Amino acid sequence: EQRHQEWLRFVDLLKNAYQNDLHLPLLNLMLTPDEREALGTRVRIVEELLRGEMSQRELKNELGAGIATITRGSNYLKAAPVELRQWLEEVLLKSDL
Amino acid sequence: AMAEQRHQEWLRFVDLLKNAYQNDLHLPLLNLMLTPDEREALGTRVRIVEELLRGEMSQRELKNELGAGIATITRGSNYLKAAPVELRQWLEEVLLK
Numbered sequence: 001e002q003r004h005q006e007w008l009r010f011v012d013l014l015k016n017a018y019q020n021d022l023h024l025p026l027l028n029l030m031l032t033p034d035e036r037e038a039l040g041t042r043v044r045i046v047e048e049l050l051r052g053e054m055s056q057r058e059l060k061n062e063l064g065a066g067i068a069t070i071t072r073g074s075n076y077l078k079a080a081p082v083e084l085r086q087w088l089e090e091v092l093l094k095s096d097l
Numbered sequence: 098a099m100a101e102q103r104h105q106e107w108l109r110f111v112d113l114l115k116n117a118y119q120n121d122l123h124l125p126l127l128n129l130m131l132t133p134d135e136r137e138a139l140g141t142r143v144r145i146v147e148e149l150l151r152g153e154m155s156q157r158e159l160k161n162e163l164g165a166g167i168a169t170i171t172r173g174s175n176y177l178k179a180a181p182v183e184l185r186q187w188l189e190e191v192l193l194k
């Protein structure tokens with residue numbers, strides 16, 4: 001329960017950092033290179049899962065990512081609220097015909 | 098080469114999250130994009146930063162109070178030392194005051 005408040009304090013700190021144009025150095029302080037790389041790759045995974053055109057072998061090759069992480073992210077995406085999903089489709093699939 | 102593509106992919110995440118905050122979708126986005134263990138780590142890292150800036154606890158004392166390992170605290174202290182002065186001063190204002 002207190003872990004939850006601690007998480008929310010991070011969320012609020014980062015909100016305020018974006019407001020003050022300090023988000024880039026804050027994220028450089030708070031995340032390791034491997035975590036930042038994972039987040040960048042997760043964006044690409046979410047995009048391709050929302051697109052829904054690739055097979056599992058194709059996802060692995062296109063994304064340079066492992067099946068275990070793709071599988072878990074797909075469940076997180078399934079569980080996401082439609083308010084978020086529709087916004088992500090708008091953003092991450094913005095070029096798709 | 099790898100590295101420059103990774104940086105662009107990172108910036109894409111930074112923009113996505115910026116826009117999620119603007120649309121009040123940051124919490125569901127971060128629930129999608131991070132695991133429970135990663136969120137817990139970030140909450141703990143805020144406390145580590147806070148206590149390093151406060152400068153009252155020893156690092157081993159910080160270990161017990163935060164349930165954290167020495168390796169994590171030592172690494173965090175280096176990231177904090179490397180951070181730009183503008184960020185450090187803002188953190189002191191928003192976390193400690």
Ligand SMILES: O=C(O)CCc1c[nH]c2ccccc12
Pocket residue numbers: 042043045046068069070072073074076129130131132
């Ligand atoms: O590797 C894992 O345990 C899942 C990491 C993860 C969190 N959100 C995601 C979104 C898309 C792809 C993967 C993830």
Ligand SMILES: O=C(O)CCc1c[nH]c2ccccc12
Pocket residue numbers: 029030031032142143145146168169170172173174176
């Ligand atoms: O090694 C870890 O567990 C995380 C390293 C790390 C990066 N930025 C941090 C900020 C505060 C505390 C720890 C860290």
